[PDB]
A paper describes a structure:
Sequence comparison of human and bovine P VP8*s shows 86% amino-acid identity. However, there are several significant amino acid changes from human to bovine P, including S180A, Y183Q, I158N and F192S. To investigate whether the sequence variations within the VP8*s of the same genotype lead to any structural changes, and how they account for differential glycan binding, we determined the crystal structure of VP8* from a P BRV strain B223 at 2.2 Å resolution. Comparison of the human and bovine P VP8* structures shows that despite the overall structural similarity (RMSD=0.66 Å), the J-K loop in the bovine VP8*, which has several sequence alterations undergoes significant structural change. In the bovine VP8*, this loop with a different set of inter-residue hydrogen bonds projects in an opposite direction compared with that of the human VP8*. The backbone conformational angles in this loop from residues G179 to G184 are also significantly altered. Comparative analysis clearly shows that the amino acid changes S180A, Y183Q, I158N along with the altered conformation of the J-K loop in the bovine VP8* result in the loss of the binding pocket for type I Galβ1,3-GlcNAc motif. The residue Y183 in the human VP8* that is involved in a stabilizing hydrophobic stacking interaction with the type I glycan is replaced by Q183 in the bovine VP8*, which in the structure is shifted 5.3 Å away because of the conformational change in the J-K loop. S180, which interacts with β1,3-linked GlcNAc of LNT through stabilizing hydrophobic and hydrogen-bonding interactions, is replaced by A180, which based on the superposition of the structures clashes with this moiety. In addition, I158 that is involved in a hydrophobic interaction with GlcNAc in the human VP8* is replaced by a hydrophilic residue N158.
Numbering used by the authors: 63 to 225
The structure:
């Protein structure tokens, strides 16, 4: 397969209908997005064999706290989400993966899609979140590649088997 890039970390109203495969080297926030009105989302990368740790996250000009706990040898991308600024974030989905690879796509409605699952095999799934942010600034906080949603299958290949 082929991918446009890699491109450096960017914050902008990125084009919809294409997969942004992020390839972080380090843990922490790899992805975030908010319209400042209806939807707040960030993804925190947790290292394998990370004992229970209380960490402080400054993201989207907000500073919050999360508990990370990963007893596996796989990496874990954790999604946190809220629909109002005064609301507390909630963890909805996470992805256990051997590779530092997650991918995000904004559909025609502005909904955010990414890979969910307890593994990158049988439990792997392409999920979609339910609060559309069509014009919101998207923060890809890592080197990323660009794949058309034409080739969701090419993106899936790298998610399962690395790059």
């Amino acid at each position: 397969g082929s991918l446009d890039g890699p491109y450096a970390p960017d914050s902008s109203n990125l084009p919809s209908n294409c997969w942004y495969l992020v390839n972080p080297s380090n843990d922490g926030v790899v992805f975030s997005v908010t319209d400042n009105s209806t939807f707040w989302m960030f993804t925190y990368l947790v290292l394998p064999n990370t004992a229970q740790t209380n960490v402080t996250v400054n993201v989207m000009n907000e500073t919050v706290n999360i508990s990370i706990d990963n007893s596996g040898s796989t990496y874990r991308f954790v999604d946190y989400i809220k629909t109002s600024s005064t609301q507390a974030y909630g963890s909805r989905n996470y992805l256990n993966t051997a590779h530092r690879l997650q991918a995000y796509r904004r559909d025609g409605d502005g909904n955010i899609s990414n890979y969910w699952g307890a593994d990158t095999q049988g439990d792997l799934r392409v999920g979609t979140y339910s609060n559309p942010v069509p014009n919101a600034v998207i923060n890809l906080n890592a080197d990323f590649y660009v794949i058309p949603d034409s080739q969701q299958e090419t993106c899936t290949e790298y998610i399962r088997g690395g790059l």
